[PDB]
């Protein structure tokens, strides 16, 4: 973990390991 | 607004974790 790029599919990937089977937000900005 | 900030630069799992339920 020394550089993580989040965006779309990858956005849930990073939020995935943190959230896990608890569900994340991944809400749109505009 | 995580897509309009975590997709323009790099974030940190530390914070990335505050976006859970």
How far apart CA A1 and CA A5 sit, in angstroms, is: 11
Residue A29: burial class (beta carbons within 10 Å; 0-12, 13-18, 19+): exposed
Contacts of A11 (CB under 8 A, 6+ apart): A26, B2, B3, B6, B7
Write the Ramachandran bin of B7: left for phi over 0, alpha for psi from -120 to 50, otherwise beta. alpha
Experimentally determined by: NMR
CB A27 within 8 Å of CB B6 = no
How far apart CA A24 and CA A18 sit, in angstroms, is: 8
Q: Which of A5, A23, A28 sits opposite B21 (nearest CB)?
A: A23
Q: Residue B20 corresponds to which tokens in the numbers above?
A: 């859970």
Q: Which of A18, A29, A30 sits opposite B16 (nearest CB)?
A: A18
How far apart CA B10 and CA B18 sit, in angstroms, is: 15
Residue B21 near chain A (CB below 8 Å): yes
Per DSSP, the three-state class of A29 is: coil
């Amino acid at each position: 973990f020394v550089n993580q790029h989040l965006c779309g599919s990858d956005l849930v990937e990073a939020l995935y390991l943190v959230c896990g089977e608890r569900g994340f937000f991944y809400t749109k900005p505009t | 607004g995580i897509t309009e900030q975590c997709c323009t630069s790099i974030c940190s799992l530390y914070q990335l974790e505050n976006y859970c339920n």
